[PDB]
Design a protein around this motif. Structure first.
Motif, short mmCIF file in Angstrom:
data_model
loop_
_atom_site.label_atom_id
_atom_site.label_comp_id
_atom_site.label_asym_id
_atom_site.label_seq_id
_atom_site.Cartn_x
_atom_site.Cartn_y
_atom_site.Cartn_z
N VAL A 261 -57.56 37.97 -15.79
CA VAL A 261 -57.04 39.07 -14.97
C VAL A 261 -55.53 39.24 -15.11
CG1 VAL A 261 -57.21 40.13 -12.71
CG2 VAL A 261 -58.83 38.36 -13.38
N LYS A 262 -55.12 40.47 -15.39
CA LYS A 262 -53.79 40.78 -15.91
C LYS A 262 -52.89 41.45 -14.89
CE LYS A 262 -56.50 41.14 -18.26
NZ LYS A 262 -57.76 40.36 -18.39
N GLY A 263 -51.62 41.10 -14.91
CA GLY A 263 -50.63 41.84 -14.17
C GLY A 263 -49.32 41.83 -14.92
N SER A 264 -48.76 43.01 -15.18
CA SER A 264 -47.43 43.09 -15.77
C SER A 264 -47.37 42.41 -17.13
CB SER A 264 -46.38 42.49 -14.83
OG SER A 264 -45.10 42.54 -15.43
N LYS A 265 -47.99 43.02 -18.15
CA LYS A 265 -47.81 42.58 -19.53
C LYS A 265 -46.36 42.23 -19.81
CE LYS A 265 -47.09 45.72 -22.50
NZ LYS A 265 -45.91 46.51 -22.97
N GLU A 266 -45.44 42.82 -19.06
CA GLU A 266 -44.06 42.36 -18.98
C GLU A 266 -44.01 40.86 -18.70
OE1 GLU A 266 -45.50 44.77 -17.48
OE2 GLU A 266 -44.50 46.64 -18.01
N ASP A 267 -45.15 40.26 -18.34
CA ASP A 267 -45.30 38.81 -18.30
C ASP A 267 -46.31 38.27 -19.30
OD1 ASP A 267 -43.58 38.98 -16.04
OD2 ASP A 267 -45.33 39.41 -14.78
N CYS A 268 -47.02 39.14 -20.03
CA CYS A 268 -47.87 38.65 -21.11
C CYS A 268 -47.11 37.70 -22.02
CB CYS A 268 -48.41 39.81 -21.93
SG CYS A 268 -47.29 40.30 -23.27
N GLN A 269 -45.86 38.06 -22.33
CA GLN A 269 -44.96 37.14 -23.00
C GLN A 269 -44.94 35.81 -22.27
OE1 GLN A 269 -44.02 39.55 -21.13
NE2 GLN A 269 -44.18 41.34 -22.45
N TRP A 270 -44.54 35.83 -20.99
CA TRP A 270 -44.53 34.62 -20.17
C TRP A 270 -45.71 33.74 -20.50
CZ3 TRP A 270 -42.19 31.94 -16.19
CH2 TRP A 270 -40.97 32.45 -15.74
N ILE A 271 -46.89 34.33 -20.44
CA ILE A 271 -48.11 33.61 -20.76
C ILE A 271 -47.98 32.98 -22.14
CG2 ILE A 271 -50.51 33.86 -21.45
CD1 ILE A 271 -49.20 36.15 -18.78
N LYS A 272 -47.77 33.81 -23.15
CA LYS A 272 -47.88 33.34 -24.53
C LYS A 272 -46.82 32.31 -24.87
CE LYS A 272 -47.86 37.63 -26.01
NZ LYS A 272 -48.25 38.45 -24.83
N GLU A 273 -45.59 32.54 -24.43
CA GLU A 273 -44.51 31.59 -24.67
C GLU A 273 -44.78 30.27 -23.97
OE1 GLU A 273 -42.51 30.57 -22.15
OE2 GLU A 273 -42.90 32.04 -20.58
N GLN A 274 -45.20 30.33 -22.70
CA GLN A 274 -45.56 29.11 -22.01
C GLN A 274 -46.63 28.37 -22.79
OE1 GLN A 274 -46.00 31.48 -18.47
NE2 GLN A 274 -45.00 29.91 -17.23
N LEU A 275 -47.67 29.08 -23.20
CA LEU A 275 -48.70 28.56 -24.08
C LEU A 275 -48.07 27.79 -25.23
CD1 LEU A 275 -51.01 31.67 -24.35
CD2 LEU A 275 -51.43 29.58 -23.06
N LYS A 276 -47.31 28.51 -26.05
CA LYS A 276 -46.69 27.91 -27.22
C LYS A 276 -45.99 26.60 -26.87
CE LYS A 276 -45.00 27.06 -31.18
NZ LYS A 276 -44.13 25.91 -30.84
N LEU A 277 -45.08 26.64 -25.90
CA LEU A 277 -44.39 25.44 -25.45
C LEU A 277 -45.42 24.34 -25.20
CD1 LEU A 277 -42.45 27.42 -22.80
CD2 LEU A 277 -41.27 26.40 -24.75
N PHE A 278 -46.52 24.72 -24.56
CA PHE A 278 -47.57 23.76 -24.26
C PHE A 278 -48.36 23.45 -25.52
CE2 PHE A 278 -47.62 26.33 -20.09
CZ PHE A 278 -46.35 25.87 -19.80
N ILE A 279 -48.77 24.50 -26.24
CA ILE A 279 -49.34 24.34 -27.57
C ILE A 279 -48.43 23.51 -28.44
CG2 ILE A 279 -50.36 25.59 -29.49
CD1 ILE A 279 -50.62 27.97 -27.59
N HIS A 280 -47.14 23.47 -28.11
CA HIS A 280 -46.24 22.57 -28.80
C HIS A 280 -45.84 21.37 -27.98
CE1 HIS A 280 -44.03 21.90 -32.45
NE2 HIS A 280 -42.98 21.53 -31.75
N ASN A 281 -46.18 21.33 -26.70
CA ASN A 281 -45.80 20.22 -25.85
C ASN A 281 -46.43 18.92 -26.34
OD1 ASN A 281 -45.35 18.37 -23.70
ND2 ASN A 281 -45.23 20.06 -22.24
N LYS A 282 -47.75 18.83 -26.27
CA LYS A 282 -48.40 17.55 -26.48
C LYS A 282 -49.31 17.54 -27.69
CE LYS A 282 -48.29 16.89 -21.49
NZ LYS A 282 -47.28 17.96 -21.28
N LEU A 283 -49.91 18.67 -28.05
CA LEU A 283 -50.59 18.77 -29.33
C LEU A 283 -49.68 19.30 -30.42
CD1 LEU A 283 -52.59 22.00 -29.62
CD2 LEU A 283 -51.18 21.47 -27.67
N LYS A 284 -48.57 19.92 -30.05
CA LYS A 284 -47.55 20.38 -30.99
C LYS A 284 -48.17 21.28 -32.06
CE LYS A 284 -47.73 16.62 -30.95
NZ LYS A 284 -48.73 15.74 -30.29
N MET A 285 -48.73 22.39 -31.58
CA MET A 285 -49.26 23.40 -32.48
C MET A 285 -48.53 24.71 -32.23
SD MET A 285 -51.03 24.13 -35.01
CE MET A 285 -51.50 25.65 -35.82
N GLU A 286 -48.56 25.58 -33.23
CA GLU A 286 -47.79 26.81 -33.25
C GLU A 286 -48.62 27.97 -32.72
OE1 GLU A 286 -48.28 29.42 -35.69
OE2 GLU A 286 -50.13 28.49 -36.40
#
Length: 447
Positions: A261-286
């Motif tokens: 459920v979506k609000g403010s794609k102006e935060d879709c970035q927020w989602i994806k960047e947080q993901l990446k950081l996490f995708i790079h946090n402990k599994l370190k994937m791009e």
RNA sequence: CACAUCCAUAACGUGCGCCCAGAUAGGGUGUUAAGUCAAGUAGUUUAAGGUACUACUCUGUAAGAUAACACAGAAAACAGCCAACCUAACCGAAAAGCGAAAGCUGAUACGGGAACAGAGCACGGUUGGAAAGCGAUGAGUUACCUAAAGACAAUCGGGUACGACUGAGUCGCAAUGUUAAUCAGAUAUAAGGUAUAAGUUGUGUUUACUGAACGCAAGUUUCUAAUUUCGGUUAUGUGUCGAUAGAGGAAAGUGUCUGAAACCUCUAGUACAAAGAAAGGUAAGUUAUGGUUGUGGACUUAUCUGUUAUCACCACAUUUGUACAAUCUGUAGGAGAACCUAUGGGAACGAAACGAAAGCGAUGCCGAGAAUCUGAAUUUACCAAGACUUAACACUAACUGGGGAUACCCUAAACAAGAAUGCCUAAAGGAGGAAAAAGGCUAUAGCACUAGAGCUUGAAAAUCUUGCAAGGGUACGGAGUACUCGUAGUAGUCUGAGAAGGGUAACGCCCUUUACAUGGCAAAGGGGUACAGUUAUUGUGUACUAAAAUUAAAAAUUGAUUAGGGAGGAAAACCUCAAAAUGAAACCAACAAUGGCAAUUUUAGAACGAACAAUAACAGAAUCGUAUACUCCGAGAGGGGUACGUACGGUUCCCGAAGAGGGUGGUGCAAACCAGUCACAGUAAUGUGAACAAGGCGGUACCUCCCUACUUCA
């Protein structure tokens, strides 16, 4: 026989406490434990899973290790290892394999059991779909129409699965509460077992005769722990993602991933960047592809061969969702076997097929019906039955061409197809060219 | 919004093939002669040419009739096709004499039979002129409302490909091709077409190669594509709803009742011009993967006398470009589904298709009609094939004589060869007594292993084994060398070739002379023998040493990193009688960080295996010069595959078993009449009884082996 893990993972070195995830699994240990105690560990050397229609074969009772695994007989696993990830035809989710050895063909049930061990805990949904599922078809249909009313949505793309077999976060997150706080080793010494001889080395998984068909389990976990905190931060932000776009979130899988459920794609970035950081946090994937093609309100993505965008074409919409069927999964599925060329007859025909001189015919007919069957199941609740039977048109003349071609006539496909056909209205007879197609693209589809 | 259509057409698969002697037996082939033909009508002219002309006639000229004359054409025979039509070939049967059956013996009669195309030589030959076809049914059996929505009488009110059947009545395409009649030149180096083999990699087409050497050039056919509803599901039309357009708003708009502010209706498809509005016909190209085309159907390009005109003038598609027209039309990116610019309705937004690509100069060839211009001609100027018959001459074969060795098959041929009497009453009579056979005879019966039968023979005879001069068949394209035998002959002069040399070809053939006695010839199949490729089996094989791609990585230090040393029952603790019913030093586990040799490979320290010895070499898809219809135009360049019609090189990889025909071994079933055996009668032999242990024998089942010109699958 094999109570090795039945003892390792069970008692678990309670100097101080242990498998603590117990307020929800405390007698959930002995249930499946004593199951395996007499499911697998009953007396088996050569059974309970494998070749004999489910089960291993009792050629030598396969006890050369099975009974005697008190120390696994172990010590090297030479087992020449190679690389293996097999793609999946519909709803792309690769299905790796390995090397078939009776050794590996008992390691298979061993890891089956370690699954059941890790199964009952916070692991959820053997293969993909956030809801506990087993099939793609449930993943194919259920989750989707339920949400998406919020516009501005996004998806996932990171390959990150068999490329990012991190193998460090892997063994850091396999058996946390399951590894006996001390002396739990006679488990994974023979799961960490990708040995070779080419003046090089790569261990423990690539679809490995140690790690071949079990990546389902393992990678599912690998992602699962991620998805846990993913959902926690998901709710942490689900305060206008269900409340921003409204005035008139996420769900987890195996390979690709929606943004729920979506609000403010102006935060879709927020989602994806947080993901990446996490995708790079402990599994370190791009972020493979920097993933996904934000719809920006509705623009249709694609999942598993379907999607939603929240003369051969017509549709109805509104404040409602939808579940798109497609053509690229058929387009090249046509140019593969010479099945048509759309630049020939006025918008779309089966202008031709491939086989002209080949083996017996009725088998080829059953082949047609078989891919059609697949199509039906491989197309659950998606709209436009008319494109389905449209392709069926786009399949008839072709398959009938191939039938005729064995006769090697004057393009005598007319009389030839009259010599058979569920569609010619004449075992020298097509059992189904459209019937089962209609039947199964309605059943388990329209509901 | 359903339902639905996607090209129809035959092959090629005939039967034959060796050896030489001959040549009308016929036939064919070609060449020369002579005649001999037929030309819309006549003259012209002339041979009796030939069609040029004169004048006459006819037919056509749709670019929609109507009259003028222009313009073209006017037979015949051939070539062919289409259909019917005997008949020798070739086929099976009587058929028929025939080893006495193995094999022959087939105008008998047998259907047929353009032999599965005649590609190594047509079924023949008569006719006839038209069959198969399609696209419209002509004629019958017929359909939904009777355009209002019906219910009603289908007020045939009314519609036959109405839609189905029967079924076409008629046309067109089907159904043709050639055939003698000025030159010379220019505009041809004209405008236009033409020049890299059996073939390798390279992808950013860049080209590293060869039987290419050409190079340039290097990316690229294409789609991706309609707003004046082109909204409604591809081309198929109908079934619509949506919006505007209402027409009666009924008893339909044939006669009856419910119709409705719906349920029919055209929908409702914008303003010009513009053109034929249009066909048919011919010509070119696209047509459907199999390989070849043919024959039609569809798409595309041109096509088809002048006025006198009636006509002539229209609806409609049509085309443009504008408008504008929405789905925008996609794109691009942002950014709400309805903003944002862009886009021509594709700019990319790709995608597929893309790699000595194409396009550019390679000049390779010719360069018709020679189209046009120039001259020439201009007695109608001429002028010579078009076939038919015959002639002659060469020619000739799947035609006419004689020629048959290698291996099989068969058994007649007495073909020749090799197989022989018990028993007494226990002895002459003698079994050709009185016992007592096979063999002799005949269907041969009891599954074979008894043919009954009578004497018989008790060497008669028939034993089998061969052999089997016989007699057949079988191979008489063609598949590496020699080499062999079978016949030295029969061309003896005459070009495998006799020889030399030269042209001698991507292997011959032809020219100077050899020889007249084989000087060629040698024959003629066919097999044989050694070598040569094949396929396999086996014997056989490398880390034989050097560095390297670092598995070897034991060992050692590391990576002291935590976790150990209990198949246990074990549910948070019970831990199992356990140090232990929860206390290590090294032995697994960490980029093995290095060796270390095996596993490579090549560089390579490199010696009949980092390859060799005995037992199979078939099957070619067709094969380039050597053609093969050669293929196709010829104006040229050059374009395809018929004894596997390649005749070699090279190309190159296929490298099957089964149906099981028939023989072979074993295994079984059966069988126990005869000889096995037992016992009994019997003097014995035979008769009697048992007797299946398959002693043999055959029936039968399996499998094995051969077996596969017995059959057939990549």
């Amino acid at each position: 026989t094999m109570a090795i893990l039945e003892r390792i993972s069970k008692n678990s070195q309670e100097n101080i406490d242990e498998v603590f995830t117990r307020l929800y699994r405390y007698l959930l240990r002995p249930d499946i434990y004593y199951v395996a105690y007499q499911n697998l560990y009953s007396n088996k050397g050569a059974s309970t899973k494998g070749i004999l229609d489910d089960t291993a074969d009792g050629f030598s009772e396969e006890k050369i290790k099975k009974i005697i695994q008190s120390l696994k007989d172990g010590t090297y696993y030479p087992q020449p290892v190679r690389r293996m990830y097999i793609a999946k035809k519909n709803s792309k989710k690769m299905r790796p394999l390995g090397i078939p050895t009776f050794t590996d063909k008992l390691i298979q049930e061993a890891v089956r059991i370690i699954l059941e061990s890790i199964y009952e805990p916070v692991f959820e949904d053997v293969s993909h779909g956030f809801r506990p599922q087993r099939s793609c078809h449930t993943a194919l249909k259920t989750i989707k129409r339920e949400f998406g009313g919020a516009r501005w949505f996004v998806e996932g793309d990171i390959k990150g699965c068999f490329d990012n077999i991190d193998h460090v976060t892997l063994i850091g997150l396999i058996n946390l509460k399951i590894k006996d706080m001390k002396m739990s080793q006679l488990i994974y010494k023979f799961l960490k077992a990708g040995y070779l001889e080419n003046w090089q080395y790569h261990k423990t998984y690539s679809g490995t005769p140690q790690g071949g068909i079990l990546s389902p389990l393992l990678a599912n976990i690998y992602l699962h722990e991620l998805d846990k905190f993913v959902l926690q931060l998901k709710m942490k932000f689900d305060r206008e993602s269900p409340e921003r776009i409204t005035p008139e979130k996420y769900v987890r899988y195996a390979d690709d991933f929606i943004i729920s459920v979506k609000g403010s794609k102006e935060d879709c970035q927020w989602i994806k960047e947080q993901l990446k950081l996490f995708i790079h946090n402990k599994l370190k994937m791009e972020l493979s592809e920097e993933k996904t093609l934000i719809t920006h309100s509705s623009q249709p993505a694609r999942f598993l061969g379907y999607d939603i965008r929240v003369v051969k074409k017509r549709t109805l919409n509104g404040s409602v969702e939808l579940l798109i069927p497609l053509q690229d999964k058929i387009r090249q599925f046509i140019f593969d076997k010479k099945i048509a060329i759309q630049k020939k007859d006025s918008s779309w025909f089966p202008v031709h097929r491939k086989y002209l001189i080949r083996s017996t015919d009725l088998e080829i007919i059953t082949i047609y019906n078989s891919e059609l069957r697949g199509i039906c199941n491989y197309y659950g609740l998606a709209s436009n039955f008319n494109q389905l039977n449209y392709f069926a048109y786009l399949m008839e003349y072709s398959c009938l061409k191939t039938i005729a071609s064995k006769h090697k006539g004057t393009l005598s496909k007319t009389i030839s197809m009259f010599k058979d056909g569920s569609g010619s209205w004449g075992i020298s007879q097509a059992p189904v060219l459209y019937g089962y197609a209609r039947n199964t693209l309605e059943n388990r589809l329209k509901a």
